[PDB]
Amino acid sequence: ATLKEVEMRLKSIKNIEKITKTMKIVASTRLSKAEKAKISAKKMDEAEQLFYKNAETKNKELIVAITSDKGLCGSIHSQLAKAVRRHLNDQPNADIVTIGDKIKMQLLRTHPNNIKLSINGIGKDAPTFQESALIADKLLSVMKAGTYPKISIFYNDPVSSLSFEPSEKPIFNAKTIEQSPSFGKFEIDTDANVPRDLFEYTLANQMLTAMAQGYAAEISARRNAMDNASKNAGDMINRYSILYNRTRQAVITNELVDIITGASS
Amino acid sequence: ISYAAYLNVAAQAIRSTELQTASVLNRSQTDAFYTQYKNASEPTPITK
Amino acid sequence: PTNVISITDGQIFLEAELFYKGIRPAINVGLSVSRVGSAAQVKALKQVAGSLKLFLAQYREVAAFAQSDLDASTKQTLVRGER
Amino acid sequence: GEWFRDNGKHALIVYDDLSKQAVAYRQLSLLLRRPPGREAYPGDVFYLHSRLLERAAKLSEKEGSGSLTALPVIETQGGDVSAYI
Amino acid sequence: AEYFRDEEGQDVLLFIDNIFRFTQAGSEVSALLGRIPSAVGYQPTLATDMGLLQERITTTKKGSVTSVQAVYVPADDLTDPAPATTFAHLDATTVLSRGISELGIYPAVDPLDSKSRLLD
Predict the structure, then answer these.
(1) Comparing C-alpha atoms, which of D74, D76, D69 is closest to residue D5?
(2) How do A95-99 and A115-118 pair as beta strands?
(3) Do A7 and A91 belong to one domain?
(4) Pairing of strands D11-15, D68-72
(5) What distance in Å separates the CA atoms of residue B5 and residue B16, rounded to the nearest whole number?
(6) A102 is in which domain, residue-wise?
(7) How many angstroms separate the first and last alpha carbons of chain D?
(8) Across the interface, which of D33, D35, D82 has its CB nearest the CB of A262?
(9) Within its chain, how far is the Cα of A234 from the centroid?
(10) Using CA atoms, how far apart are residues C45 and C19, in angstroms rounded to an integer?
(11) CA-CA distances (angstroms) from residue A65 to A92, A220, B38, B39?
């Protein structure tokens, strides 16, 4: 009727609220572990960066990007897609390697020449060295990473506890390491190819950090998003509650009139 | 075998003694599929 | 309510949400119309008040979708609207 | 329609809208002052629609295989599939 | 209108605003007249009465009269039997809805609830 169709729809809205509540709590739980990982990762990164800074290493072109497989984690997926698009204008010929289904789908739409290597299955777990290493190893073999005159990784830096801003950084090429402004009394090995080895080592060490920063931003976004969902759902509960209440009153009155009409005759 | 792959195998070996926590074991587990693409076209996805 | 609305010339709807949230008089400007002309209010208060009804139904629009990425155009309007 | 049916010439009758018959019967009944039924429609409104609709049916080969086919075309009252008519 | 349409034989126009008021007015007199009212309280002569008027307004072979009739939907529920019975007799309708009015678009014509035989 009005009453039953209203009533079932309100029940649906209620169930939606319950799910959005549940997810929001679970997301918070997941987030605490995520943050813990990211802290450790970031600490490690600073040590590697210490060399690059002090060395003042100063760098087609590769673009690498990070998002999870998982969707509905707010606008992480599409803000990063937008910043990939921005730097895809800049260099038309760059080969984009997409680590994550979500960035794969969005990027594939904007230019379908980009995708050369892509991953799938990374997003559902915390960053782990094992993952980074394997991706790195494949990055060298499959894409022949050393060829590019620029490597750049794009990720979502989890800027503040309620924000994420898409960010990029350049992984220095092996050529870059060689010719580095201060490659002063850095190095002593002329035998071991410290540039060609350090390149490989920082390919992964940098990538792991990027993945870690990303994972934290992703889970943080999902928490934020599911929180806003709960609020939006609440508003819908209240609005349909008023509709329900009115509809209920109306049915009682309308039915009552029919009985009256009969008695009156 | 990349430099970081070289280190990777060594790390995997190091998680072998048996007194080690679950999180260590979890860090050795992985699950991924490198899906190659070209042009559009997609050469088949295969586990790392 | 509707039967009365139909008879009267214009409505000056007051909104519970605004009333509660400390705007007194709580004159919602979304649902207040005056079907009776703007040749009601004196010319001074027509000139100065020019387009302010429109502007505050632009503040209404701006803050409707404010709850994503606010550009300076929206922000300027929002700042004006809020004041 | 029955002239077709009896004669053994297959035919089809569209009764559009059957809903307007119900409105019509409502007026008729209610100013005869027969007791008003549920939702004000006549008390034997079901009987009105039933007697009309049941008069189209495929006949046997005994009776020359006639067949009036019927299509009532009821208007929904705005979505309510549980309204009396 | 008929005098112009028929006898004077020129194209006419007719505006009736608000022809719900015709329906409504009948419902007011109805109770007093002595007829047990039909559902939602409207006159039990609702269908015929709407009919007699709204079929007098028609483009005869004598002349063509484009007519525009405005229906005040009571309570704003179009499913109510009195606005509902109006819908049948109109060649084009452009239902204007309170929701679209709230969104600010004036004219407030609902864009998904208009139809005309000419739309074809």
Answers:
(1) D69
(2) parallel
(3) no
(4) parallel
(5) 18
(6) 26-225
(7) 24
(8) D35
(9) 26
(10) 26
(11) 16, 18, 17, 18
Q: Return the CATH number at A200.
A: 3.40.1380.10
Whether residues A47 and A17 fall in one domain: no
Amino acid at A243: L
How far, in Å, CA of A96 to CA of A90, rounded? 13
Residues A81 and A198 grouped into a single domain: yes
Q: Which of C24, C35, C80, C83 is catalytic?
A: C35
Experimental method: cryo-EM
Map A233-253 to HEC letters. Answer: HHHHHHHHHHHHHHHHHHHHH
> Could you tell me the CA-to-CA distances from E114 to C57, E16, E83, E117 in Å, in that order?
27, 19, 15, 10
Q: With b meaning 16 or more CB within 10 Å and e meaning fewer, what string describes A66-76? A: bbbebeebbbb
**D24 Cβ under 8 Å from any chain E Cβ:** yes
A1 and D82 within 8 Å at the Cβ level: the answer is yes
Same domain, A221 and A246: no
Q: Is some CB atom of chain B closer than 8 A to the CB atom of A128?
A: yes
Both A14 and A56 in one domain: the answer is: no
Q: Under DSSP, is residue C48 helix (H, G, I), strand (E, B) or coil?
A: coil
Residues A156 and A204 in one domain: yes
Smallest CA–CA distance from E73 into chain C, residue? C2
- Count CB atoms within 10 A of the CB of residue A167: 18
Structure tokens at A87: 């730097």
Residue A243 belongs to domain with CATH number: 1.10.287.80
Dihedral in degrees, nearest 10, Cα atoms E95, E98, E104, E106: 30
CATH, range B1-48:
1.10.1620.20
Are A257 and E36 inside 8 Å of each other by CB? no
Only one residue has tokens 């002063």, namely A184
Identify any residues that bridge with C32 across adjacent strands, giving them in sequence order.
C12
Tell me, yes or no, whether A115 and A72 share the same domain.
yes
Give yes or no: residues A68 and A114 share one domain. yes
Q: Which two tokens stand for residue D33?
A: 């002052």
Quote the CA–CA distance of E37 and C58 in Å, as a whole number.
48
